[PDB]
Short mmCIF file of C-alpha atoms in Angstrom, two decimals:
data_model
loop_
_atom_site.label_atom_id
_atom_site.label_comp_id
_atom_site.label_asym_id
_atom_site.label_seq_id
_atom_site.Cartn_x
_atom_site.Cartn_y
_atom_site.Cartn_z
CA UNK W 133 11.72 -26.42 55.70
CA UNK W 134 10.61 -24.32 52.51
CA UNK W 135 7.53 -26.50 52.28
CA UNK W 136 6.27 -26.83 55.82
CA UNK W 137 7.40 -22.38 56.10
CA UNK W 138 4.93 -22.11 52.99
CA UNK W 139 2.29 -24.28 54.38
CA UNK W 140 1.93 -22.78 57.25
CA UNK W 141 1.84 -19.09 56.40
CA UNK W 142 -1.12 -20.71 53.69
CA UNK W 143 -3.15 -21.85 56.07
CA UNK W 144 -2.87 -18.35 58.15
CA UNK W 145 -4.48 -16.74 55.09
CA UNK W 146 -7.69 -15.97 54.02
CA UNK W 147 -8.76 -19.33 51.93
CA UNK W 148 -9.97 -22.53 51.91
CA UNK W 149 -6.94 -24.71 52.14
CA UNK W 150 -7.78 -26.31 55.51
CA UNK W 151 -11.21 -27.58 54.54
CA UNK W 152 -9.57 -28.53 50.86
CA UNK W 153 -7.06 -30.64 52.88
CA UNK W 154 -9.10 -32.08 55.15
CA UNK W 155 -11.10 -33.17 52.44
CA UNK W 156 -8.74 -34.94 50.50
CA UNK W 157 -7.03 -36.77 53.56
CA UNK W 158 -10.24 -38.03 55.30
CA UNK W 159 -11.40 -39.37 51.35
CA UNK W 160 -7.83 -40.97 50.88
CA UNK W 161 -8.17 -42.30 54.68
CA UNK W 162 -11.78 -43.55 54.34
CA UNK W 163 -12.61 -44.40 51.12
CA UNK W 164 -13.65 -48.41 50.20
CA UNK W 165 -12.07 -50.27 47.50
CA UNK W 166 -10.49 -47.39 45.69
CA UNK W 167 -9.46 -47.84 42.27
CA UNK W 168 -5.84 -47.03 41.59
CA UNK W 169 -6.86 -44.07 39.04
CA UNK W 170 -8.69 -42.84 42.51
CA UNK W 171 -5.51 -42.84 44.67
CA UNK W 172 -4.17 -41.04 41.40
CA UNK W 173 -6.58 -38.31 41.21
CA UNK W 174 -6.31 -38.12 44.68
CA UNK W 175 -2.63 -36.38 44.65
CA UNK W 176 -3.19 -34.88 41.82
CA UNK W 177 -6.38 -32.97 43.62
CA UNK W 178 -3.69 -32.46 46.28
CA UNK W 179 -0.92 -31.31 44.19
CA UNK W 180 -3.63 -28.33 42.41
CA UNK W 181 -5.10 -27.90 46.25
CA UNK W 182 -1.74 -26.98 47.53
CA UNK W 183 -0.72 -24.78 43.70
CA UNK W 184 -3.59 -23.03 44.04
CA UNK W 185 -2.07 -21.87 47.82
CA UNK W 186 1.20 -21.16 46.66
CA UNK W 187 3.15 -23.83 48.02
CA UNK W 188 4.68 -27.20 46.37
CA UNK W 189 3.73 -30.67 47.32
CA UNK W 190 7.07 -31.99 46.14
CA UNK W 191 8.77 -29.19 49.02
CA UNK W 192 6.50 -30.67 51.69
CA UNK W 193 7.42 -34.33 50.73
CA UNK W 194 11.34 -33.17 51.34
CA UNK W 195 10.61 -31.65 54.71
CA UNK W 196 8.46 -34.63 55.77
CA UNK W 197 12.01 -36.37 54.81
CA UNK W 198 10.05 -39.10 52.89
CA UNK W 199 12.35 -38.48 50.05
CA UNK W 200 15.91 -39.88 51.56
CA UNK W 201 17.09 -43.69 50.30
CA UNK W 202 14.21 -45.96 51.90
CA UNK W 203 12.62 -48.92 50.09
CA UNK W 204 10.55 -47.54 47.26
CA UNK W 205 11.00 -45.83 44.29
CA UNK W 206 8.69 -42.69 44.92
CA UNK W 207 6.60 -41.99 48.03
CA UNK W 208 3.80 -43.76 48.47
CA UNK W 209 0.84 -41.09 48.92
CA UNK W 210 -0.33 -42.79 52.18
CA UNK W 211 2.64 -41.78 53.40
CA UNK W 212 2.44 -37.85 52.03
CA UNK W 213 -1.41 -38.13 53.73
CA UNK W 214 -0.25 -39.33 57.36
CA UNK W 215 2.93 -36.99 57.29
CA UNK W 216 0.56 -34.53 56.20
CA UNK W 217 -1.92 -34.92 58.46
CA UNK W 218 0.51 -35.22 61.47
CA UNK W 219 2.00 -31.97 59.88
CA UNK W 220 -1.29 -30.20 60.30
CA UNK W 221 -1.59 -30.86 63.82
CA UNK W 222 2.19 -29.72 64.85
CA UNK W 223 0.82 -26.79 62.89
CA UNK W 224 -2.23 -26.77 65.25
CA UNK W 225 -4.67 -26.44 63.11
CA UNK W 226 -8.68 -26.06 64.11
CA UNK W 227 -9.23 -29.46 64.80
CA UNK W 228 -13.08 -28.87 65.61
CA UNK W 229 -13.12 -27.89 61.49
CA UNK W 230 -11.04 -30.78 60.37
CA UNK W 231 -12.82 -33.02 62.16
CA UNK W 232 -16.34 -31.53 60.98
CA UNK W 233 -15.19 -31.77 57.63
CA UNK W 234 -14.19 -34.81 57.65
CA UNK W 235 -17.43 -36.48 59.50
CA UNK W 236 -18.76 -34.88 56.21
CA UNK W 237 -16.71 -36.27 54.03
CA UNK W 238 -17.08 -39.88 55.51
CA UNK W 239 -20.67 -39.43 55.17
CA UNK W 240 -20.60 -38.35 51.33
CA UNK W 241 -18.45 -40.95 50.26
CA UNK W 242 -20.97 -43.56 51.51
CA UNK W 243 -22.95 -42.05 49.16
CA UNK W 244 -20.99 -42.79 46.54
CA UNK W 245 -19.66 -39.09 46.16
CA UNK W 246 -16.09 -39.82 45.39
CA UNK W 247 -16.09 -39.05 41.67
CA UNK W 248 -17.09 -35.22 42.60
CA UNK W 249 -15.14 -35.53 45.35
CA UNK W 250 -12.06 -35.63 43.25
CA UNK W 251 -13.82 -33.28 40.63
CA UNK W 252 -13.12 -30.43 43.85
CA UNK W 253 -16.73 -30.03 43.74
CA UNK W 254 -17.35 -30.89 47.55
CA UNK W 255 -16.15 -27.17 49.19
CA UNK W 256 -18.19 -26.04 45.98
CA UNK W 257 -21.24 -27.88 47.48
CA UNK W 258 -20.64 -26.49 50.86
CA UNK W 259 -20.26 -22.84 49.56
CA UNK W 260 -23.76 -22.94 47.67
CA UNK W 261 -25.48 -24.34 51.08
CA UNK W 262 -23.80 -21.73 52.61
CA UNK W 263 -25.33 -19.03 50.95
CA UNK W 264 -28.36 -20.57 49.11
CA UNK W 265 -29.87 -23.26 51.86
CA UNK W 266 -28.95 -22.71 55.48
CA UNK W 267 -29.89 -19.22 55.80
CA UNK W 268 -31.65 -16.91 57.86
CA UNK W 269 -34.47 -14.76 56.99
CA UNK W 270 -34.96 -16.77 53.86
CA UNK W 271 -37.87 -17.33 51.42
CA UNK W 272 -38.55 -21.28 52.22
CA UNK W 273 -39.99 -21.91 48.43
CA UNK W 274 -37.16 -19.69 46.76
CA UNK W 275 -34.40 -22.43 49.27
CA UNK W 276 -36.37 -25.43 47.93
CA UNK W 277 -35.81 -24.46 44.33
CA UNK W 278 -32.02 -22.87 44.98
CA UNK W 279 -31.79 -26.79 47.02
CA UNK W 280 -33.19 -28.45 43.47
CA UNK W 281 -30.20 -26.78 41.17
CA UNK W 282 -27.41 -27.20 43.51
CA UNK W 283 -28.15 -31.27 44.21
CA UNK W 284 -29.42 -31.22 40.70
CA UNK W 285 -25.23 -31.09 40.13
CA UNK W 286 -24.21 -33.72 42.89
CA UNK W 287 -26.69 -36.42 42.42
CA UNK W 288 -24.65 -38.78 44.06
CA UNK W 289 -25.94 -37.16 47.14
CA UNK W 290 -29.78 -37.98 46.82
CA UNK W 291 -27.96 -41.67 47.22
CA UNK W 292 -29.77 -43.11 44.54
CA UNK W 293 -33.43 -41.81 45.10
CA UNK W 294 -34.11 -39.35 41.85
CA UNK W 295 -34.39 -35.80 42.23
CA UNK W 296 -37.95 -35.55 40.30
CA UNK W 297 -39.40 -37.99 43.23
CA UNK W 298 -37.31 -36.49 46.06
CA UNK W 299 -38.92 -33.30 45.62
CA UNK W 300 -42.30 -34.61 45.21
CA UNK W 301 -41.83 -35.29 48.99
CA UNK W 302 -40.20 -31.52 49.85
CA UNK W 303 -42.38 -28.73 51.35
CA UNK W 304 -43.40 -26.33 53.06
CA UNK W 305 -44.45 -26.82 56.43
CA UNK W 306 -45.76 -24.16 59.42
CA UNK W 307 -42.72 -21.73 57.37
CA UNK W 308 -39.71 -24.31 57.80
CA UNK W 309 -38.48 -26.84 55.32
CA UNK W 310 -40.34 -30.37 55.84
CA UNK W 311 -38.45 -33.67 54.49
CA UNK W 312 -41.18 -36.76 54.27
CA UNK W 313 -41.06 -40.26 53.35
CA UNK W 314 -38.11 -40.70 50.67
CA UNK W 315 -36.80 -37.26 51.01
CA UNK W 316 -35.65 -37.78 55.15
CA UNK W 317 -32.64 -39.07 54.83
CA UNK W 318 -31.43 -35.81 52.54
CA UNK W 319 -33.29 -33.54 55.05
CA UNK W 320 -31.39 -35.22 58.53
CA UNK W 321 -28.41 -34.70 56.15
CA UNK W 322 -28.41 -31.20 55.74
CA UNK W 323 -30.11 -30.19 59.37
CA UNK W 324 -27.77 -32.55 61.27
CA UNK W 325 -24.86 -32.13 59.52
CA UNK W 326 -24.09 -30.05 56.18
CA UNK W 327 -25.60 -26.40 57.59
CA UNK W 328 -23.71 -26.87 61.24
CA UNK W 329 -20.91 -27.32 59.02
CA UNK W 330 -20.98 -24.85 56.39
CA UNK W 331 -22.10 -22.20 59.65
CA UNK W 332 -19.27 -23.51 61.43
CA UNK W 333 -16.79 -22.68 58.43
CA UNK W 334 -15.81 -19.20 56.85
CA UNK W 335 -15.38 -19.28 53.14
CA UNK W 336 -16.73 -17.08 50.37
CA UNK W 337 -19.32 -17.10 48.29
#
């Protein structure tokens, strides 16, 4: 249909959608005892995700048919997510991405990231580490202070260990970035997993 045609010339173009999608169904899919105003904010992060690509959420609920008679009044957005996320991979979508994004996503909720999460502010995060933080040919003290602003904005991140003493414990070592004591965790975060990610993905600055 109109939504699915829409959707899938979307994801063929040069943007973010994929990520932004995978996002917001591996938070819906993962989160713990979300709130009601979360599941809210949820679609409504969905129905600006998909705006901002040009299609309609309401023409993608149609052609996932979840619209007919059935035993609601509405659609649940569980429902919209799996449909959605089965859509994506009739659509065959780059799995390895999706999945990457959403091992990230699982990881920053247990962090208690979900606020920013539904702020948008997660492909944000992984845009400034793309271009600020996992770098090549970089200045190590000039990444440690570009590191400082952009968690300085998701503190939800440091998971509960303040910035002031998390940096106490960030240096330089033999020219790399060196995490010790309180600051590991953060460090494993970002070497394991946020700069294979944000290398893996193409998005602009």
């Amino acid at each position: 249909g109109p939504g699915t045609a829409c959707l899938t010339k979307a994801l063929k173009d040069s943007g973010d959608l994929l990520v932004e999608l995978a996002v917001i169904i591996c938070a819906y899919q993962n989160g713990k005892d979300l709130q009601e105003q979360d599941f809210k904010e949820l679609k409504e992060l969905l129905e600006r995700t998909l705006e901002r690509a040009g299609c309609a959420l309401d023409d993608i609920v149609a052609d996932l048919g979840l619209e007919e008679l059935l035993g609601s009044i509405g659609v649940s957005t569980g429902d919209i997510i799996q449909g959605l996320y089965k859509l994506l991979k009739e659509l065959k979508i780059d799995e390895t991405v999706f999945n990457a994004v959403c091992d990230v996503t699982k990881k920053m909720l247990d962090n208690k990231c979900l606020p920013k999460i539904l702020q948008g502010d997660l492909v944000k995060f992984l845009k400034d580490l793309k271009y600020k933080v996992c770098i090549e040919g970089g200045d190590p003290e000039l990444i440690i202070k570009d590191l400082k602003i952009i968690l300085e904005r998701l503190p939800c991140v440091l998971g509960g260990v303040g910035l002031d003493d998390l940096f106490k414990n960030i240096f330089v070592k033999d020219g790399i970035l060196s995490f010790e004591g309180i600051a590991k965790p953060l460090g494993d975060l970002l070497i394991l997993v946020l700069c294979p990610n944000v290398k893996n993905i193409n998005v602009s600055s």
